[PDB]
Each structure stands twice: as C-alpha cells, then as structure tokens.
C-alpha cells in the first residue's frame, strides 16, 4: 500500500551516486516534488526488499526524511520528500559552512537528537549516523535519512563485535558534532582506519575542536564512554542541545569561527 506504479513517476535531475545506487530529483503525480533513490538491480528481490523496508515505514517523524511511496519491482525505487539543500555534509563544507556559528550548528544538532529521540523511543538502531547522512532543507532544517564500514563513526563494541544499539548510535552522533563543529572535517585528522581503531581501544578521544566551548566537547566525550550504558540517551542529549544557550553557556560569546 506504499506502492505505486512507476509511470507515477517523473525522474529530472541526478543528484548524486553512491554504492548501492542513484539519487534523482523528480515529480510525482505531476504534481509533487520529491526525491527517488534508485537500487542498482540485483541489488535485492522484491520479497527481500519488503521485509527490510518495514522500519522506514513505521518511522513517521517530522526530523526525519519522510517516505513517500515505494517501488518494489527491479529497478527498486524509494520516494522520500525532497530536502532542498543536500547533505549536512556538503552543507558544511561548502558556501555556507563559513556563516555558520554555534547557535545555528548546535540548534542543527538538537533537530538531529530529536529525530534520533524519536528512533530511540520507538527501539529502532540507525547504525550509520554521520553528516552524509543527515540532509538539508530551507531554514536550516536538517532531517536524518538512509537505511541501506565507516569505523571513524562507528562505536568500538560495534565494529568490533556487531554490538549495534542506541547506545553506539549515541556514540555516532558524538563524532557528527565534531563534524558540526569543525564544519565538516573528517574526524581523526590524519589517522586511518586502523590506527583509530588501535588508539580508541587505548582511550584517546578526539580533543576539543578550536573555539568549541569545553562544555560541548564535554558532551562529545560522554558520547563516546567505553561503555554503552554510560552513553547518555538522545532525549538527554536533544534537550541539553534545545536548551545550550540558557542552561549551559549563557555567557557564550561569538568567535571567528564558531
């Protein structure tokens, strides 16, 4: 009953390519714009694909991309409602990563903890929370999407042992505030996936980012607790972030930077 018939759909613009497969901008029932996530074909049958497909359909939350409708015969297509400025990632980095200060990256970060607070509530895992996965919209809306490794992102008992709960999720969303507040570098600078791995299992932890107020790499550091269950929940960490600027820095003072 997510289905729809293909001809439904108008693909116009590439937007992008990854993996798995392509992202159009497009136009649904003549009428609506959205986005389609085309699968590469083989990718997966139409019965597999139903059985995967059950959580971003059960998950309806206004901080993350809505689904729209489903295709589920080769080529595979997923319509979501279409977020007008790409990925945080992109964001971050490009024109616009040099207007941006804390107020409007931590105010990102708490919409972000609001859709994870929602993922939490209804006991569901991400497992690939990072910027690239965050998207973009007027007035700085960001969404959380994609629910198709990247170790700089991934909690140790994860990676390590398959270990994927909120809890490592938690510790995902600690390394996307560095990516936040470095606008959008990647964390570990100069270090590969093994020496990560090596030195996190040793205790280091990323420093605080330059101008970043010791209080939110405090937060980052909580994230990433050797153990899951130290980790704070995202309806902390959405509700510390909603309230930074009153309850924790109230004498935050605009930088350079951040």
């Given at each position: 009953?997510?289905?729809?018939?293909?001809?439904?759909?108008?693909?116009?613009?590439?937007?992008?390519?990854?993996?798995?497969?392509?992202?159009?901008?497009?136009?649904?029932?003549?009428?609506?714009?959205?986005a389609?996530?085309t699968?590469?074909?083989?990718?997966?049958?139409?019965?597999?694909?139903?059985?995967?497909?059950?959580?971003?359909?059960?998950l309806?939350?206004?901080?993350?991309?809505?689904?729209?409708?489903?295709?589920?015969?080769?080529?595979?297509?997923?319509?979501?409602?279409?977020?007008?400025?790409?990925?945080?990632?992109?964001?971050?980095?490009?024109?616009?990563?040099?207007?941006?200060?804390?107020?409007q990256?931590?105010?990102?970060?708490?919409?972000?903890?609001?859709?994870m607070?929602?993922?939490?509530?209804?006991?569901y895992?991400?497992?690939?929370?990072?910027?690239?996965?965050?998207?973009?919209?007027?007035?700085?809306?960001?969404?959380?999407?994609?629910?198709?490794?990247?170790?700089?992102?991934?909690?140790?008992?994860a990676?390590?042992?398959?270990?994927?709960?909120?809890?490592?999720?938690?510790?995902?969303?600690?390394?996307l505030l560095?990516?936040?507040?470095?606008?959008?570098?990647?964390?570990?600078?100069?270090?590969?996936?093994?020496?990560?791995?090596?030195?996190?299992?040793?205790?280091?932890?990323?420093?605080?980012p330059?101008?970043?107020?010791?209080?939110?790499?405090?937060?980052?550091?909580?994230?990433?607790?050797?153990?899951?269950?130290?980790?704070?929940?995202?309806?902390?960490?959405?509700?510390?972030?909603?309230?930074?600027?009153?309850?924790?820095?109230?004498q935050?003072?605009?930088?350079?930077?951040?």
């Amino acid at each position: 009953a997510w289905e729809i018939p293909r001809e439904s759909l108008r693909l116009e613009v590439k937007l992008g390519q990854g993996c798995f497969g392509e992202v159009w901008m497009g136009t649904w029932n003549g009428t609506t714009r959205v986005a389609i996530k085309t699968l590469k074909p083989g990718t997966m049958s139409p019965e597999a694909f139903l059985q995967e497909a059950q959580v971003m359909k059960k998950l309806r939350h206004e901080k993350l991309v809505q689904l729209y409708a489903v295709v589920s015969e080769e080529p595979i297509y997923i319509v979501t409602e279409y977020m007008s400025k790409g990925s945080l990632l992109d964001f971050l980095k490009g024109e616009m990563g040099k207007y941006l200060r804390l107020p409007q990256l931590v105010d990102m970060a708490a919409q972000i903890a609001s859709g994870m607070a929602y993922v939490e509530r209804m006991n569901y895992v991400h497992r690939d929370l990072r910027a690239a996965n965050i998207l973009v919209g007027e007035n700085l809306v960001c969404k959380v999407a994609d629910f198709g490794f990247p170790i700089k992102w991934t909690a140790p008992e994860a990676a390590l042992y398959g270990r994927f709960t909120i809890k490592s999720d938690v510790w995902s969303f600690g390394i996307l505030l560095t990516e936040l507040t470095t606008k959008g570098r990647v964390p570990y600078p100069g270090m590969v996936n093994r020496e990560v791995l090596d030195q996190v299992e040793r205790g280091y932890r990323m420093p605080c980012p330059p101008e970043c107020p010791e209080s939110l790499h405090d937060l980052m550091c909580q994230c990433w607790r050797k153990d899951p269950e130290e980790r704070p929940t995202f309806e902390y960490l959405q509700a510390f972030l909603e309230d930074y600027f009153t309850s924790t820095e109230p004498q935050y003072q605009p930088g350079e930077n951040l």
